[PDB]
Amino acid sequence: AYTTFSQTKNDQLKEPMFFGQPVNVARYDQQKYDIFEKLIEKQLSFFWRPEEVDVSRDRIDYQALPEHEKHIFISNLKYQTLLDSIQGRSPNVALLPLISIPELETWVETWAFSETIHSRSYTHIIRNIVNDPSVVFDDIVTNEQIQKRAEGISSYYDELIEMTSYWHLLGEGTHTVNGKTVTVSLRELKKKLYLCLMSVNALEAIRFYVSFACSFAFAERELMEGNAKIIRLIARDEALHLTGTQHMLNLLRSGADDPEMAEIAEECKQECYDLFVQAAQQEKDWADYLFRDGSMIGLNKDILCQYVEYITNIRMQAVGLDLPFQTRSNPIPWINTWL
């Protein structure tokens, strides 16, 4: 079972990142993988307050915008708000119960914490450029187009969480819950997790960047500059986040942390691969919705769609996987300005 303070005096330097002995003492004078200590120190130094950024000038700009340019902006903001709504709570609930080294535990809490700040920044934008914030928030939940990907994201999480409870309550082996066979495999858990980790990596490394492009496009036209300033700070963070997930995944597949993982990584190769292809495809389809009533300067389907592929190829490379798309270059190199 899970314990908020394991009684055993284990060597934290020799525990796996996951599934080992729950972390007891929170120490930071040493670590198994200092990338996590570095990320924490970096996240702490990037601390920023949303309320500070003046978005008052964005209300007029947003209003001026045509009903189809409002669609793009607000729709993209709604998606960002969704992602971080998830990410704020999710890494804590899903990963915290499985960490076994102190640096990763605290990194995840720091990481989740920073996502709540982003959520707040979104509330800061929305309530300052619209007269009925409730319309925006409620639609995030109802908007069936936002939910297509919203439901796919929370399943990897929900399923990992639910299967983690069984493991802590019953243990490995086959059980019966009210006349129902329920099998609990550690090798299966390590896979369920590996997939969330890979799915979380695509969310941080791809989903969010597709949103900064179709966000800074406005900043390029000198529109919504309060928002651009805020999303510049969020991108700096999401960069830390993707560095963390990338290190986790590459530490797992390298058998450096836990061989059984590495094995499950090679075996679960086509999934991890078709998992990304699914994500990229979902970001492209998203584009058809943002431009159903016309595009704008510097951003249309072909532009975005092309960025999705370019970006997806970059992210999978970082985790050793064949570029699912042609090997082209940045359709909007200007984006590097805001990053």
Of 325 and 338, the one with the shorter C-beta distance to Mn ion is: 338
119 binds Hg ion (CB under 5 A): no
Angle at 143 between CA 240 and CA 71, to 5 degrees: 75
Q: Choose among Hg ion, its own copies, Mn ion, none what residue 27 binds, the Cβ cut-off being 5 to 8 Å by kind.
A: its own copies
Restricted to residues 59-118, the positions that interact with Hg ion (CB under 5 A) are 76
The site partner of 297 among its own copies, Mn ion, Hg ion, none (C-beta below 5 to 8 Å per kind) is none
162 is in an annotated binding site: no
Where in 166-195 is the site for Hg ion (CB under 5 A)? Answer: none
Structure tokens at 234: 């969020």
Alpha-carbon gap, residue 12 to 89, rounded angstroms: 26
Q: Give a three-class secondary structure readout of 87-129.
A: HHHHHHHHHHHHECCHHHHHHHHHHHHHHHHHHHHHHHHHHHH
How many Å apart are CA 116 and CA 290, to the nearest integer? Answer: 26
* Binds Hg ion (CB under 5 A): choice among 108, 129, 235, 305: 305
Which residues within the stretch 130-159 sit at the binding site for Hg ion (CB under 5 A)? 156-157
Residues acting as catalytic residues = 122
Comparison of 27 and 292: residue with beta carbon closer to its own copies: 27
Residues numbered 201 to 230 that lie near Hg ion (CB under 5 A) are 214
299 binds, among its own copies, Mn ion, Hg ion, none (CB under 5 to 8 A by kind): none
- Count of residues binding its own copies (CB under 8 A)? 73
Stretch that binds its own copies, among 39-47, 230-238, 240-248, 279-287 (CB under 8 A): 39-47
* Alpha-carbon span 236 to 74, nearest angstrom: 22
Q: Tell whether 139 is in a known binding site.
A: no
C-alpha atoms less than 13 angstroms from C-alpha of 60 in its C-beta half-sphere: 5
Q: Name which of residues 140 to 179 contact its own copies (CB under 8 A).
A: 140-142, 147, 150-151, 153-154, 157-158, 161-162, 165-166, 168-170, 175-179
Cα separation, 243 vs 229, whole angstroms: 22
User: In this structure, what DSSP letter does residue 43 have?
Assistant: H
- 34 near its own copies, rule: CB under 8 A: no
Judged by beta carbon, residue 169 or residue 256, the one nearer its own copies is: 169
- The DSSP secondary structure of 62-96, one letter per residue, reads HHHS-HHHHHHHHHHHHHHHHHHHHHHHHIIIIIG
Cα angle: 242, vertex 245, 247; to 5 degrees? 105
Closest CB to its own copies among residues 162, 302: 162
Contacting residues toward Mn ion, per CB under 5 A: 84, 115, 118, 204, 238, 241
Of 113 and 273, which CB lies nearer to Mn ion in the complex structure?
A: 113
Residue 204, annotated as binding a ligand: yes
199 makes contact with Hg ion (CB under 5 A): yes
Whether residue 309 contacts residue 328, with contact meaning beta carbons closer than 8 Å, is answered with yes
Distance, in Å, from the CA atom of 192 to the CA atom of 229, rounded to the nearest integer, reads 37
